[PDB]
């Protein structure tokens, strides 16, 4: 977890998922277009095996 | 600044005619000198419901008369009038006043010496029309007769009449007969002495590219070198700035050019990233280059509308590793984001690469070996010896370039 | 940017003057001392070439990654391309809404309708992005700008 | 990742033409490379220009221009720049090594992230088989082993010498080699390239039409090649589709896909080393597939040391194919390879004891010694693979006794 830069994963994920091509004014955006840019992938301190134990490096 | 073009010899005239027709097509100047109204800019977006104004610099090469007629800054020097007649008929815009009409190199050199005053008057007349002159461009063949001697004498005359205060390029064409090696070495001696930056073009390699005429490729490369000057951008926009970026020392002045052929075929390059990688290929260079080559300087030209910056950045990063740089030169690859002429309907990209590599060792070695084989008043033999020693003076220098 | 281009052009003048001097003096000098002077001149010109390459790379980066990207991203893409938002997502035509107002005489204008404060904020953000870029920010406990200026002083010397 | 297709020889070119026609039909790409009105990913097999044109990544290699001319004229969207024109053929391939190496490096540079090389060639192709055998060597040498190779080699129905010489390099350098026999293909039909094209097109279906799983060729192949020695795959295709009396359920597809008559190579009793079944339909009933998987596991004879798992991929049908009924492809790794390899070795020995046509290859004393040592090495390698496939069958395979 700590031996790698966290901020790099965000960028390397956005190049894959939330890439974009813009559309002219008045052209309706797709709902997928709106929700693509909302998503954020981040590293959290709560590991899977620890977070799932609550709701039972 | 302003650029004056000089064409010497039959090959030089043949190349220059297409070079000037290319420039006239890009700038929308018709063959009669009449100008075309400038189309509206493409990236200058405007609100929408749902004549002399320009943003290029054509006058850097053409003299704009008071009657809105353009005229090239060219000087045609040769002896056979058939090629000049064909060139003038194809392009009536050429000024008749600028034409000068008259095998052994010595005979041509002596003819240039005897009639030097008239040619010098013509050069001065052309310069007087130029304010803040920048450089001279020469189109001539190293071997072939009239071009060699006349171009060499004009080289010396221009170099010493203006005190070398303006740089002087040279779009020399190398030959692909008993007299040819002598002419090649004799002209190359003055190329070493006077020229500031030489674009070496080899006819055999030009034929190799073509079969995949030969003068059209030279015209395209020459007319694409000066793209930043005629369509100014952030960088360069000056002929001295482009040359200074590829010539580390006065001796290492010989440049070579690579050309991307597929500017029109419908299987053209997908994007800028692909073309950046394809330009480094050795099969499309205009000079035969082996695998032991090393590059002293890099310069890539890109010509298109709204180039993708991501592709260019990634292409530069990938191409930097592939290229074998000389040990004492920092790894540096530069890309010129040229602007396509709005008059051209073709939307495909074009890209020309200009390089200063160490492949000149083999080319001048071949020339030297042929000269040595052929050698086997007395003044001329002394000049031959001097040319041999001058050529060796850069043979060994390009070899030493390998070493820190 | 004016300082950077001033140095870029000064190097060109340096190149021209030294190249002309090479033809006018060194090559015509006596053969005894021609070699040491030729070597020194070549060293000087190679140093100039290194400096020119560095300056050209810096200018290329700024011009085609800071100014051009910011322009295309903050001005062209704000004005002409759709500023897609969560309220534009809703397609109100699930309501009948047969009527249209105020009238067909009111044009649709190919550009986002911006308020006065919106125009001021748009141009302010466009300028701020360039001036406060990663390289041009004030953040060895020294900023990038100071190092660049130190190299520029080296070239001046 | 992207894939590069290599077509060698006349049979390879014809099969490749059928394959690319099938692929373009599936992705709606027109003959000129223009799109037709995305969730699928043709980029893995086609290069997309910024003028909206799709061109295949394949490279055409042939000794004569007639086949290449037919292939290019039939499909105008081929890039002409990629067109290039036994021992004699292999020595000819040595001469053209530089041109071919640069030609392949162009395609590798053009793609973003290369995954694998596909090769369409015929083992019994004579000179073209020689140039393909050299192609495998040069590719494996230059690109190392990080990128794997898949060869859809067509087996034969003087030929024994050619088959042995090609099979030596096929064993040495290929990473996953399909086996097709013209005998079983024409038996199934009771033209033939349309079966090979269909199988090859379906094998990569999970890549071009992504789903929940099997998104990469590594996952597809690794399930079938426990050991690099056992690299030959047997493919089975269900022919009864698009008729009125089609398979009524995917469960019957799973049960009847295992019939020995549908296999694309001559088979008696066989032991399966690995399994993977393709089911390709708009909608698939899960419970039928569960029942079919259970029955298939209880019916099929696996080798003792294999995990004994049957994998069923839920392929998605192309939108450009209108509501067609279910179809399915089965790819297996059997021990039946010993029979065909033994047949080839028997023919080779029979024709090697009799110096029938070796004069066309043995030119001098040094040539005699060269061909003898080459033939001996090829024969020994084939025997080694036969012994390995035979030792896989027994239960003491993992024992050091």
Automatic annotation (TrEMBL), chain A:
Similarity comment text for this entry: Belongs to the TUBGCP family.
Name recorded for this polypeptide: Spindle pole body component
Phylogenetic lineage: Eukaryota, Fungi, Dikarya, Ascomycota, Saccharomycotina
Coiled coil, from the record: none
Subcellular location as annotated: Cytoplasm, Cytoskeleton, Microtubule organizing center
Domain of life, per lineage: Eukaryota
From TrEMBL, chain B:
GO CC annotations, alphabetized: gamma-tubulin complex; microtubule
A Gene Ontology molecular function term of the record: GTP binding
Pfam families: Tubulin, Tubulin_C
Domain of life from the UniProt record: Eukaryota
CDD domains tied to this protein: gamma_tubulin
UniProt key word GTP-binding: yes
Subcellular location: Cytoplasm, Cytoskeleton, Microtubule organizing center
GO biological process: cytoplasmic microtubule organization; microtubule nucleation
InterPro entries: Gamma_tubulin, Tub_FtsZ_C, Tubulin, Tubulin/FtsZ_2-layer-sand-dom, Tubulin/FtsZ_GTPase_sf, Tubulin_C, Tubulin_CS, Tubulin_FtsZ_GTPase
Family statement: Belongs to the tubulin family.
Name of the protein in question: Tubulin gamma chain
Record lineage: Eukaryota, Fungi, Dikarya, Ascomycota, Saccharomycotina
From TrEMBL, chain C:
Domain of life: Eukaryota
Bilayer-spanning residue ranges: none
Subcellular localization, as worded in the UniProt entry: Cytoplasm, Cytoskeleton, Microtubule organizing center
Protein family per UniProt: Belongs to the TUBGCP family.
Protein name in the entry: Spindle pole body component
Naturally occurring in which organism (per UniProt): Candida albicans (strain SC5314 / ATCC MYA-2876) (Yeast)
Included range, full protein: 543 to 704 of 785
């Amino acid at each position: 977890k700590l031996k790698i830069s966290v901020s790099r994963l965000q960028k390397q994920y956005d190049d894959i998922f939330k890439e974009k091509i813009e559309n002219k004014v008045g052209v309706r955006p797709s709902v997928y277009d709106v929700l693509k840019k909302n998503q954020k992938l981040s590293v959290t301190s709560e590991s899977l095996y620890k977070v799932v134990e609550e709701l039972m490096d | 600044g302003e650029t004056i073009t000089l064409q010497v010899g039959q090959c030089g005239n043949q190349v220059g005619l297409q070079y000037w027709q290319q420039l006239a097509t890009e700038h929308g100047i018709q063959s009669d000198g009449s100008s075309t109204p400038y189309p509206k800019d493409i990236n200058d977006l405007q609100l929408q419901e749902l004549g002399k104004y320009r943003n290029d610099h054509p006058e850097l090469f053409f003299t704009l008369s008071d009657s809105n007629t353009y005229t090239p800054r060219s000087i045609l020097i040769d002896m056979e009038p058939s090629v000049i007649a064909k060139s003038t008929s194809a392009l009536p815009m050429f000024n008749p006043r600028n034409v000068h009409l008259s095998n052994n190199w010595i005979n041509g050199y002596k003819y240039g010496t005897e009639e030097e005053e008239t040619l010098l008057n013509l050069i001065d007349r052309e310069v007087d029309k130029c304010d803040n002159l920048s450089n001279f461009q020469l189109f001539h063949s190293v071997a072939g007769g009239t071009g060699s001697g006349v171009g060499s004498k004009m080289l010396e005359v221009i170099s010493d009449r203006y005190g070398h205060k303006k740089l002087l390029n040279t779009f020399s064409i190398f030959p692909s007969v008993v007299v040819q090696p002598y002419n090649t070495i004799l002209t190359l001696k003055r190329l070493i002495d006077y020229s500031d930056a030489t674009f070496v073009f080899h006819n055999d390699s030009l034929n190799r590219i073509e079969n995949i005429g030969a003068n059209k490729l030279i015209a395209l490369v020459s007319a694409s070198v000066s793209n930043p000057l005629r369509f100014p951008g952030y960088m360069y926009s000056s002929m001295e700035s482009i040359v200074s970026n590829l010539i580390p020392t006065p001796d290492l002045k010989f440049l070579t050019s690579s050309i991307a052929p597929f500017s029109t075929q419908k299987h053209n390059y997908l994007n800028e990233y692909d073309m950046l990688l394809e330009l480094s290929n050795d099969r499309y260079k205009t000079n035969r280059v082996s695998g032991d080559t090393s590059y002293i300087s890099m310069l890539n030209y890109l010509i298109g509308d709204n180039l993708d910056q991501r592709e260019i950045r990634k292409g530069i990063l990938k191409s930097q590793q592939r290229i074998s740089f000389v040990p004492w030169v920092a790894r540096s690859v530069l890309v010129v984001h040229g602007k396509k002429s709005p008059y051209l309907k073709n939307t495909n990209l074009e890209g020309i690469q200009v390089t200063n590599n160490t492949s000149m060792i083999d080319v001048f070695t071949k020339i030297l070996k042929q000269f040595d084989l052929l050698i086997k008043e007395n003044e001329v033999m002394e000049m031959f010896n001097e040319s041999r020693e001058s050529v060796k003076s850069i043979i060994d220098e390009y070899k030493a370039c390998k070493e820190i | 940017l004016w300082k950077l281009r001033q140095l870029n052009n000064l190097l060109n003048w340096h190149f021209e003057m030294f190249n002309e001097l090479n033809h006018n003096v060194v090559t015509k000098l006596s053969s005894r001392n021609r070699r040491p002077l030729a070597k020194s001149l070549s060293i000087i010109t190679s140093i100039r070439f290194h400096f020119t390459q560095f300056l050209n790379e810096l200018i290329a980066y700024l011009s085609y990654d800071v100014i051009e990207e910011n322009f295309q991203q903050h001005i062209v893409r704000k004005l002409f391309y759709n500023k897609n938002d969560q309220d534009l997502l809703l397609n109100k035509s699930f309501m009948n809404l047969s009527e249209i107002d105020p009238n067909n005489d009111l044009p649709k204008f190919n550009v986002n309708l911006l308020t006065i404060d919106e125009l001021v904020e748009l141009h302010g953000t466009y300028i701020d992005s360039i001036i406060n870029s990663s390289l041009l920010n004030e953040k060895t406990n020294i900023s990038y700008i100071d190092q660049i200026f130190n190299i520029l002083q080296t070239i001046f010397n």
